[PDB]
Amino acid sequence: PFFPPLYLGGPEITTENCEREPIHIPGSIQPHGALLTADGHSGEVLQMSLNAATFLGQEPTVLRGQTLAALLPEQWPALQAALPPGCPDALQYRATLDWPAGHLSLTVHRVGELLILEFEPTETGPHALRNAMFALESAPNLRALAEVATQTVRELTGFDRVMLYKFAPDATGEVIAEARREGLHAFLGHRFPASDIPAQARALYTRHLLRLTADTRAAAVPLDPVLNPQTNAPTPLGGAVLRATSPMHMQFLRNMGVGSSLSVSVVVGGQLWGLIACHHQTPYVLPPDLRTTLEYLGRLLSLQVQVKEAADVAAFRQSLREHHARVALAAAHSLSPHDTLSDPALDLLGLMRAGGLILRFEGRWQTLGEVPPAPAVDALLAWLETQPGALVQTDALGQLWPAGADLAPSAAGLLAISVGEGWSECLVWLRPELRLEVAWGGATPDKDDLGPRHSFDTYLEEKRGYAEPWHPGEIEEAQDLRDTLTGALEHH
Amino acid sequence: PFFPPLYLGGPEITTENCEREPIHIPGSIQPHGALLTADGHSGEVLQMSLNAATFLGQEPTVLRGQTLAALLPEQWPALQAALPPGCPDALQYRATLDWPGHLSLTVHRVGELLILEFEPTEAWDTGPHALRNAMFALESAPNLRALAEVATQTVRELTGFDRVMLYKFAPDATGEVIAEARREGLHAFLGHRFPASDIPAQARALYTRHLLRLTADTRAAAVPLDPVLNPQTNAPTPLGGAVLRATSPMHMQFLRNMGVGSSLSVSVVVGGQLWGLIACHHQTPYVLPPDLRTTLEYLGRLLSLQVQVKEAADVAAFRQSLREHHARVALAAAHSLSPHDTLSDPALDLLGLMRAGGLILRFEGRWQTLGEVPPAPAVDALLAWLETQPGALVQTDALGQLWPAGADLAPSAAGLLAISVGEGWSECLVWLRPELRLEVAWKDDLGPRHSFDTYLEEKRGYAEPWHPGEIEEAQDLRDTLTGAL
Ligand SMILES: *C/C=C1/C(=C/c2[nH]c(/C=C3[NH+]=C(/C=C4\NC(=O)C(C=C)=C4C)C(C)=C\3CCC(=O)O)c(CCC(=O)O)c2C)NC(=O)[C@H]1C
Ligand SMILES: *C/C=C1/C(=C/c2[nH]c(/C=C3[NH+]=C(/C=C4\NC(=O)C(C=C)=C4C)C(C)=C\3CCC(=O)O)c(CCC(=O)O)c2C)NC(=O)[C@H]1C
Structure with a gap:
């Protein structure tokens, strides 16, 4: 049963009630881009992130109460045809714009009556994806597939760590494969309890197959107004890439020394099978065009996981x-x-x-x-x-x-x-009783508070006897x- | 039980024995690109298409008996690492070269032999956002029919083909055009069904392993390999996994009798099973650029996943x-x-x-x-x-x-x-x-008009x-x- 958000007098999100955080409605975005909401029929701009003034290159009371027909003269008709009224929130339309400031990347999706528009700045392996596709297909088993996945994703992005989590029948995680920078402690073998990814987040990750945290210590940027003029109700940003990450998880990442995060969902038969999970030790904004490449792999891997796993069995x-x-x-x-x-x-x-x-x-x-x-x-x-x-x-x-x-x-x-x-x-x-040695061995990832060191110990605790x-x-x-x-x- | 090919004194491929044509070993390629075979270990060039002299820009006895280490100095090591010895023939490595123009090298290993395909290309990309938006469209379609509509529509928008169909194979191996998108002023095939005969088992099986093949010009002359036989084993070169493989002469006629100049088709595979085909026809010759064919290949697999999900949720x-x-x-x-x-x-x-x-x-x-x-x-x-x-x-x-x-x-x-x-x-x-009866979808010889009548004949009673x-x-x-x- 969800809590109200912090901006409507909601309670503090502690480690003991976090499973009830309304992560879908933070009423704020990440500062590496900008967000508008608009009316589904009229195209009248209703809400706006405070920083949208500066990205788009117009004044904060000039944008509000303006038509998308005026603002996006070429896109507004195509945008609309791509997203028919009553289509699902998972459906997304993208196109690149040519504006003064520079080149922007418009990403639109419809949540019922409301249109949500995300603006990021935009503008290299030519056959890296194609060859990776054939590699995943011609891998002999689930482990070898998982190796090609994490290796390929790391080669494309240049992340510091790229893991693949596999969720067990009991909802606990396990790092089944890894690729990382030389001189980092391994997570291969680490398992974490079901708690560490709340059901709200699992369910959200099954609908929308990508989310990031570009800077784990950046200030969130609120929407203005925070509530939707249509219904006086909070704006559901669950399907927006620029959604503000949960403050609870942001701490967890910070305690690992993780500056940036990214993760693609692997979905088999309407079921969250696992995650490609990427960590960087400094802030890192993936360009929109490259994130699309990860999304293709997310789905190629979703198909191939199923085939290799069924053939292994x-x-x-x-x-x-x-x-x-x-x-x-x-x-x-x-x-x-x-x-x-x-x-x-x-x-x-x-x-x-x-x-x-x-x-x-x-x-x-x-x-x-x-x-x-x-x-x-x-x-x-x-x-x-x-x-x-x-x-x-x-x-x-x-x-x-x-x-x-x-x-x-x-x-x-x-x-x-x-x-x-x-x-x-x-x-x-x-x-015998299940026993596993610590995933890092010599090094430490943190220590006693919130973090992966605590998460591993508390997983083993749950598997007592x-x-x-x-x-x-x-x-x-x-x-x-x-x-x-x-x-x-x-x-x- | 396969026949020998035409170049080893094999018989004529008639309409009554075509199910035995060795389509995997034609010993020839299509003239819009060029092909080399080389030794898996040494990289010594063994066979070569006659037109390879032209494309690559070297003489016909200078290329033969040369190392890939010399010819592709940068690629030969990476090529080799990408295709370990004993890896399957389905595995393909691509890269673009910069030669006296831009070429697109596509390599795959068949046991001891390496097969290299050269086509002309450019140095950019896969998009712009047409693929990404199509991916989300397929995913958010409500049922198999609506998915099949988005598929054929999207493929037509990307390629600009004259017709783009989606065949669905029935339990009995017969086909059915479940969706279509075409140029205004062309006769519809939506609803047309064809018997199992019209796609031989050899072709079905080949289409399950390798998920793409074309015919860029239905009336062009094939280009033989020289030598036609492999020096390693004195055995025919298996071109089943090469895009540039010469299309069966039997099928080429079938296409010509429909007024089809160019063909292309992507396999849809669900659970190791040939579920159907995205099938594309053009009324004039048309060579898809390598980079764009890759986009169709991505859709082929996105659709393979999504067919399964929508079809199971429909049921x-x-x-x-x-x-x-x-x-x-x-x-x-x-x-x-x-x-x-x-x-x-x-x-x-x-x-x-x-x-x-x-x-x-x-x-x-x-x-x-x-x-x-x-x-x-x-x-x-x-x-x-x-x-x-x-x-x-x-x-x-x-x-x-x-x-x-x-x-x-x-x-x-x-x-x-x-x-x-x-x-x-x-x-x-x-x-x-009642007895199954369907009206015609839209002369007496080989063609779709014959194929429809002979399907209905098979479904008598x-x-x-x-x-x-x-x-x-x-x-x-x-x-x-x-x-x-
Ligand atoms: C009390 C709430 C818990 C929780 C909150 C939370 N966590 C997420 C998203 C993720 N949590 C993850 C857990 C781990 N990630 C790791 O890397 C490791 C150890 C190596 C663990 C144990 C993971 C993997 C994710 C996915 C994303 C990512 O990898 O960066 C959310 C959802 C936030 C959002 O979608 O915006 C929430 C609310 N984390 C806890 O530890 C408990 C306390
Ligand atoms: C017994 C020999 C026959 C046969 C041989 C044959 N056909 C193919 C490839 C295809 N045949 C197809 C049949 C149809 N395609 C159509 O568009 C229609 C009508 C709407 C029919 C009935 C199809 C779809 C293909 C796939 C490729 C494509 O769409 O162009 C092969 C194999 C080709 C190769 O790779 O070498 C062969 C050997 N065709 C006949 O009609 C019977 C007599």
């Missing part, structure tokens, strides 16, 4: 079928159940990429790899008889079974299947092997 | 309509006065649920019709036949095939979708569709096919109306 379960069949080969020609499955040539640990494994057959049990102590295994198998059905699954049995909280370091994660119905005979794969989650393809192949090994007791 | 809203309709039937079904009266009620419109021409309602030992249905005795034989079938549901685009005795009934009922209310076909609903969402909702309604007894 095809080849993943393909490996699990061959492995599964190789288990079932030895299972039919079985000397002793325990001996055949404990055989390291088969590698039942490697099928489910497990740290440990409990094998239970003919009234007794054996382990393989890292497993909890003797008595714990008996209580664990006792607990398995409590559960209904053939399959049991969890990323943290500490939650699902309270008495097994102590067993997390050996076995936080669990995947189990009963061979006969009833848990007398069963396989039980176990995974949590294991690496089971791939759905592993849970499916577990349940196929459950049915196969039932057929291997036709020898018993 | 979401389609079955969404069928749920509301289904529930509105089940509302009247529970408060039923007489089964026949309630379902024959035009306020419910059981015809409109499955978009049917006719409907047979069978309840309490008797039957009634609705809309266009075959004669009285035919309906009795049809319901007799339904008792033969196992299960609750029966489905077909042409019952003439599935039931031989109902061949005569096609004009009223070629297509059939049927469901039994109780188990056993005593009580049942039977939707019926065939109806419009049932959407899977209609067959699914049919089977849900089957279970709902069992509950109304």
Whole structure:
């Protein structure tokens, strides 16, 4: 439930209520350009940023109450045809102007009744985009795609760091690829919690696929009037590039020594899959024509992420079928159940990429790899008889079974299947608690306050007693092997 | 099973064996540019188009047996890094050169061999903002039709082609022109459908790998390679991934018979599947500049993503309509006065649920019709036949095939979708569709006029096919109306 903005007597945005900041209506822009609002039908100029006087080269009460028909004689008709009334706010029309001051870049979009116009100053790799397109397409897998992405974006822009975040099923982030300036601390591997990108921001980033912060310490430029004359309501700048960045996030960037930010959304199936995220250590305004190149990549990558990721998962379960069949080969020609499955040539640990494994057959049990102590295994198998059905699954049995909280370091994660119905005979794969070393290692990005160092520690805190989650393809192949090994007791 | 090419004593490519033409190895290029092949490791020039002497500005035995290290001193290292040995043939590296004029080098690797394409260009750009605005337009279009309109309109505005169509391949591999933009005073192709034959499987498969090919002049002479065979292996040079590949002579005739001077087409690919083509025709010869073709390639991929999204969201809203309709039937079904009266009620419109021409309602030992249905005795034989079938549901685009005795009934009922209310076909609903018929989109030999007639011939006794969402909702309604007894 949104708060009111600061300019309508809204509360202070603290770290404990930030998920309710109305980031879409700051009533102000960034000072590297200028903004006008105008009536959708009449073209009468209604609002204006204070600095618009100086960019456009006219006086502050001469622009207000003037027609766009007069101000943009060539563009006003084409502008209008490009944005029919009732079209969505995502739709944008661009063109370049030739004015005294100099060359400007007009970027227009319609929010219902209102037209919003953004003015920036304008005016080099000729085949860098085309070659990058073919490179992304001919990359072998998601990692290699992610490498080409971050590398290409860095070559085009000359940013100090270019990362690619991938959002996990639980909304937490992970830096899956990186390209950076020599002598900067790495973020590759860093994960951050869902909190650090509020749902309001996620949702906004799914609609509009680009936003920047050109100077993390610049003063915002208010609109005048701040409220829309049409409705006496705040102006929705969510789809304007020049929107003032949230003051909360601006601090976060400043605490990393980030002068400038930029990020392109990667969207697959109406879902925010990730972000190309760019940081510079000094203020840096990308020229409008170059930002367009990043936008093309944003969409080329959106298509290609989907294709490479789906083809990776095809080849993943393909490996699990061959492995599964190789288990079932030895299972039919079985000397002793325990001996055949404990055989390291088969590698039942490697099928489910497990740290440990409990094998239970003919009234007794054996382990393989890292497993909890003797008595714990008996209580664990006792607990398995409590559960209904053939399959049991969890990323943290500490939650699902309270008495097994102590067993997390050996076995936080669990995947189990009963061979006969009833848990007398069963396989039980176990995974260790999730632990990752810090992404920078030696260096520091900050320290105890708001920042990435805090964000990493507080991510690991959220994953207390949590294991690496089971791939759905592993849970499916577990349940196929459950049915196969039932057929291997036709020898018993 | 491919034939040998014409230059290795291959047979004549007729209209009856064209599905076996080795279109990937014509051993020749189009005369608006030039081609070199070179060794992947050494960079030694092996083959060369006869016209390459002219374009590059050197003599025909001076270029052959020269290194790319010498010829392209700046590019040869970068070229090589961009195309690692064993990388796929789809991967392309481009750069512009500055020679005695400006040339556009386009390189790709086919295993051991490097293939280099030279076309004339300029030193600028991809825009101005026509591409960017078109991207946002495609994205903010409401459905597949509206997307297809923006596509063909935008491509025509950028290129200035005479016609720009969008083909959509059907499940059976036949084509359909779903959208068009053209010059005022040209005959429309919107609605035209063509059979699977007219784009051979070899060409389909090639168009899935490489997403662009042209024919700059439909009556120009091809330019052979010298030598035609590769010195490495004494094997033909695979030009499948080269833009300058000579177009099949068979298709070139087809275009000429339409009065088409120039052709161009971009592949639309969704999930490793050739979904359709942006297809462009000009009535005079027309060479697209390399920089502009790149703009079409970007759209080809933007459209590939967006086709998928709009089409999946259309189908979401389609079955969404069928749920509301289904529930509105089940509302009247529970408060039923007489089964026949309630379902024959035009306020419910059981015809409109499955978009049917006719409907047979069978309840309490008797039957009634609705809309266009075959004669009285035919309906009795049809319901007799339904008792033969196992299960609750029966489905077909042409019952003439599935039931031989109902061949005569096609004009009223070629297509059939049927469901039994109780188990056993005593009580049942039977939707019926007419035979598929379409008017001409706008002589006797090869051409689109022949292709349209021969498409309709293939769809003899065939109806419009049932959407899977209609067959699914049919089977849900089957279970709902069992509950109304
Ligand atoms: C209490 C609110 C939180 C929050 C506010 C906030 N954050 C954003 C946008 C981003 N926040 C991000 C988080 C990180 N960025 C990083 O680089 C790292 C570590 C390496 C983290 C953890 C990111 C990535 C973004 C996207 C943009 C970018 O990369 O620069 C917003 C939205 C602002 C807007 O759209 O104008 C808001 C309101 N940040 C917090 O830490 C918590 C406190
Ligand atoms: C059995 C041989 C036939 C055949 C050979 C053939 N055709 C192509 C390429 C295309 N053929 C197309 C068919 C049509 N294009 C149209 O515009 C229309 C009518 C509106 C039809 C029916 C199309 C669309 C293409 C794609 C390229 C383009 O649009 O120009 C090839 C492959 C070309 C190459 O790369 O070498 C071949 C071998 N054409 C026939 O009619 C049958 C007899």
